[PDB]
Amino acid sequence: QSALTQPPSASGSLGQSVTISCTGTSSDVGGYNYVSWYQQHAGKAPKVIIYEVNKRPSGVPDRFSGSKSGNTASLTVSGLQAEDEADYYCSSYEGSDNFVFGTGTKVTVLGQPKANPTVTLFPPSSEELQANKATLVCLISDFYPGAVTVAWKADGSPVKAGVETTKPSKQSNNKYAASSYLSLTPEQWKSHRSYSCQVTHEGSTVEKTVAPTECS
Amino acid sequence: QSALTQPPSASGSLGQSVTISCTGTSSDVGGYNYVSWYQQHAGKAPKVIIYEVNKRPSGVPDRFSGSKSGNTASLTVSGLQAEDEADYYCSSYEGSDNFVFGTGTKVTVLGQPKANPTVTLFPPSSEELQANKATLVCLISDFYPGAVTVAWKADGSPVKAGVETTKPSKQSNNKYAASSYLSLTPEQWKSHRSYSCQVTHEGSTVEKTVAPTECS
Amino acid sequence: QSALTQPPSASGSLGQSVTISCTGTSSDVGGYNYVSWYQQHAGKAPKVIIYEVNKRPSGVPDRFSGSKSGNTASLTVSGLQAEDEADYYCSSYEGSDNFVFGTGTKVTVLGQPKANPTVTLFPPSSEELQANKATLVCLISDFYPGAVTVAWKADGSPVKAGVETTKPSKQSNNKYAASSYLSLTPEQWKSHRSYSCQVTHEGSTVEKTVAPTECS
Amino acid sequence: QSALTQPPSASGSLGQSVTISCTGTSSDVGGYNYVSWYQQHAGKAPKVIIYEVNKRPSGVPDRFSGSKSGNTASLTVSGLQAEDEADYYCSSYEGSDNFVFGTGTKVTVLGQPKANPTVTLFPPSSEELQANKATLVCLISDFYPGAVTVAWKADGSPVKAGVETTKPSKQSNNKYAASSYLSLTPEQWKSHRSYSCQVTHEGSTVEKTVAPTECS
Numbered sequence: 001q002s003a004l005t006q007p008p009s010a011s012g013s014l015g016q017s018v019t020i021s022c023t024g025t026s027s028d029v030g031g032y033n034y035v036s037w038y039q040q041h042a043g044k045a046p047k048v049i050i051y052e053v054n055k056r057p058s059g060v061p062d063r064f065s066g067s068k069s070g071n072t073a074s075l076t077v078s079g080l081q082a083e084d085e086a087d088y089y090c091s092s093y094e095g096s097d098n099f100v101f102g103t104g105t106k107v108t109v110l111g112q113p114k115a116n117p118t119v120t121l122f123p124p125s126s127e128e129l130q131a132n133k134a135t136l137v138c139l140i141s142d143f144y145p146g147a148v149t150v151a152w153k154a155d156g157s158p159v160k161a162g163v164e165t166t167k168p169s170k171q172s173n174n175k176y177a178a179s180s181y182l183s184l185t186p187e188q189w190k191s192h193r194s195y196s197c198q199v200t201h202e203g204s205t206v207e208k209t210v211a212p213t214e215c216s
Numbered sequence: 217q218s219a220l221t222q223p224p225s226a227s228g229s230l231g232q233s234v235t236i237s238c239t240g241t242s243s244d245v246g247g248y249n250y251v252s253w254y255q256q257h258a259g260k261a262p263k264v265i266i267y268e269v270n271k272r273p274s275g276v277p278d279r280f281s282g283s284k285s286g287n288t289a290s291l292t293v294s295g296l297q298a299e300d301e302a303d304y305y306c307s308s309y310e311g312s313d314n315f316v317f318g319t320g321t322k323v324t325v326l327g328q329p330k331a332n333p334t335v336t337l338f339p340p341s342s343e344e345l346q347a348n349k350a351t352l353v354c355l356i357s358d359f360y361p362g363a364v365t366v367a368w369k370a371d372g373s374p375v376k377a378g379v380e381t382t383k384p385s386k387q388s389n390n391k392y393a394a395s396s397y398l399s400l401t402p403e404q405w406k407s408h409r410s411y412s413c414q415v416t417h418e419g420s421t422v423e424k425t426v427a428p429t430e431c432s
Numbered sequence: 433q434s435a436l437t438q439p440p441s442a443s444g445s446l447g448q449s450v451t452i453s454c455t456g457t458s459s460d461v462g463g464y465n466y467v468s469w470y471q472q473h474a475g476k477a478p479k480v481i482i483y484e485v486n487k488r489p490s491g492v493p494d495r496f497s498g499s500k501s502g503n504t505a506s507l508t509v510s511g512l513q514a515e516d517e518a519d520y521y522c523s524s525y526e527g528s529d530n531f532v533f534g535t536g537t538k539v540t541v542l543g544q545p546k547a548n549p550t551v552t553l554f555p556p557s558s559e560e561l562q563a564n565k566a567t568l569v570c571l572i573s574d575f576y577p578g579a580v581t582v583a584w585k586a587d588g589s590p591v592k593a594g595v596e597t598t599k600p601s602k603q604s605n606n607k608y609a610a611s612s613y614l615s616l617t618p619e620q621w622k623s624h625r626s627y628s629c630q631v632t633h634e635g636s637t638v639e640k641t642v643a644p645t646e647c648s
Numbered sequence: 649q650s651a652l653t654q655p656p657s658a659s660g661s662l663g664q665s666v667t668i669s670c671t672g673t674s675s676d677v678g679g680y681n682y683v684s685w686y687q688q689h690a691g692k693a694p695k696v697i698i699y700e701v702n703k704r705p706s707g708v709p710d711r712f713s714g715s716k717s718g719n720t721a722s723l724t725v726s727g728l729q730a731e732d733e734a735d736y737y738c739s740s741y742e743g744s745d746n747f748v749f750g751t752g753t754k755v756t757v758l759g760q761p762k763a764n765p766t767v768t769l770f771p772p773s774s775e776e777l778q779a780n781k782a783t784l785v786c787l788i789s790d791f792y793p794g795a796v797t798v799a800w801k802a803d804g805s806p807v808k809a810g811v812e813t814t815k816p817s818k819q820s821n822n823k824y825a826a827s828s829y830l831s832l833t834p835e836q837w838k839s840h841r842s843y844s845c846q847v848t849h850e851g852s853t854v855e856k857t858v859a860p861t862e863c864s
Contacts, residue, residue: 126432166383
């Protein structure tokens, strides 16, 4: 369906203002005047915090803003101490036996660290070399801002047919951790050059390449 | 506060029919209509799936209605389909632009086969150990239920303050499984005798010890 | 033969919602409509209670609908009301004047309070015994569940080939209880020491012995 | 609602023809041309055996008849060996968010005896004279044709406010048995003259009177 184009996590420094945008089509969000922005303060009941454009229900606060920028719907939060710490959802109204929601701009800043992802790439074992099950597993410990873009490449170009990514979590301090792994035939492996696991941030990134070969 | 009464949890089969009950004030669901429901599954953005009272866009197969007796507004999926089970929610106009919604349900639907669990662990590359440490990662690829525990054993005894786990899953509408990680350097590693991961799951315990696999 | 698939038994509460599923050939419920349902409770004459597919005359409060996904035509009572529990049935035109109907359901609805049982036995008039026999009759007036047994004891020991019982009930939408009868003449009577009726019911046993009551 | 006026049990002698009638109003059954007559061969799925007037589905037999006698709807069964042994239901179509069913003319003849009801009347006990609970219980053993009209009178005239009648049954040979009892204050009892329990057949009847009074 639609996508209502939303960055992943917006990560300020308390006493801040962010803009979350929401691109759709030109029809809706563009011409159309009905955008809605809700808040799931750690999921559950994402409340309507913004409706119409910059309109606001009653049992929702101030500090809370939003515009219909001739093609992008944007919410501007301007404070953010112990308010934005929510999942944020942008929704586009329209008359098609539907009405659009977008992707999840989640907010926080309450943590300690906004330190980086720790990735490693464990290319296939003997599960693969013998057991013939070609699994390269790409791992990410010690996060702080839990945001995991990951993209794999197959020798040069994108790769993504039989690859999974474990929605993330990590205890102890919290931080965050997660995985992404790919499973195919041996050869698809040993016949092939290299696999890349690049988790991404904005002012973050880390890339990694595992390549085929031999034993002792 | 404007809450929408609805149970926190639903159950059923896939042979008969399920009904979630969204109840409120005559204000919201008494003398007003405009009860929309959304299909959310923790991570995709909620889907309008009965609007007004029982009006439904491509997504309602058919007997996936809702109607509102008095102010007790129940949506029924007649039949029931092996979907994923999580959150359904109802919002009504409660009028003066201040929409409100009942939370919950989720589901307990037989008609999805329990699975058994499939492990992959990949401590290696084949240097890892001569030069530093790498780290041990265990991956249960799958098994339906999502009700488990993993331990790791160093030739017979659990090592300690040397373990990190937590997640249920991802997948699409398939299963639930996660991955464990221990840092064990070299001798911490092999000096360690040999390592099984111990997947105690639903009365069946499964597990793989790994020793000399070398390079894959 | 033209049968209408529907479960033989339904269950639920009175807090949520129940759905009975009437499924058949596209002939009946595929490309034809005209699925009517009747509320029968073993003794009153069945009541049309969703006609065509979800059209309903005074009797449907409201969310007491039915809809037909594909040919799986489910009727939902949203809410559910402490009714009596027994038979619901669906008939569709299956066209060429040869209507057909699914049988069953009945119900298992919490939301009706179990009762305890209340006995009355009346062997007498006050001559009965000097002149012939009369007969012993025991009446449990009531108690909700309807899951029991009655014995009769002649000062401690069950007499034999001297007993007749069987029934669940009547009442309106209240309870279930019945009445026992033993013919015991005179001496067969008092020569008999004294008679308790023994109502073994749902883990609680209740019972009344009767001796000298004389005339009432 | 309606009543669709139907005698209770029609009781031939095999190789016979009976007429079951169905009076309603003048509107329906009268003018109206839609009567329907179904068969519950010991309950469950009462099939449509007659529709329109004398029209008959396909998987139903011959021997089976029915007319729309300008105000009474009648079915004439003409054979009856091992066919009529059913509950029989007369139904009147009409356009009032309804469609009428009538009362239950049940059929049989397969038995041994078409012998009479055995009634007794156990007027209040000490439950009543002391316990102050005024219960006169009217009992009917050894039936063959299970048909129990019962009517109580209070000194002369009808009586029926707090009186029950246990839908009937009896094991051993079968036959049939049942009860009917009345519960009121002592005085309503001892202040009052007499209570009558008349079970009725057609070419049957039995009447019984219990009157108030004293002990030893």
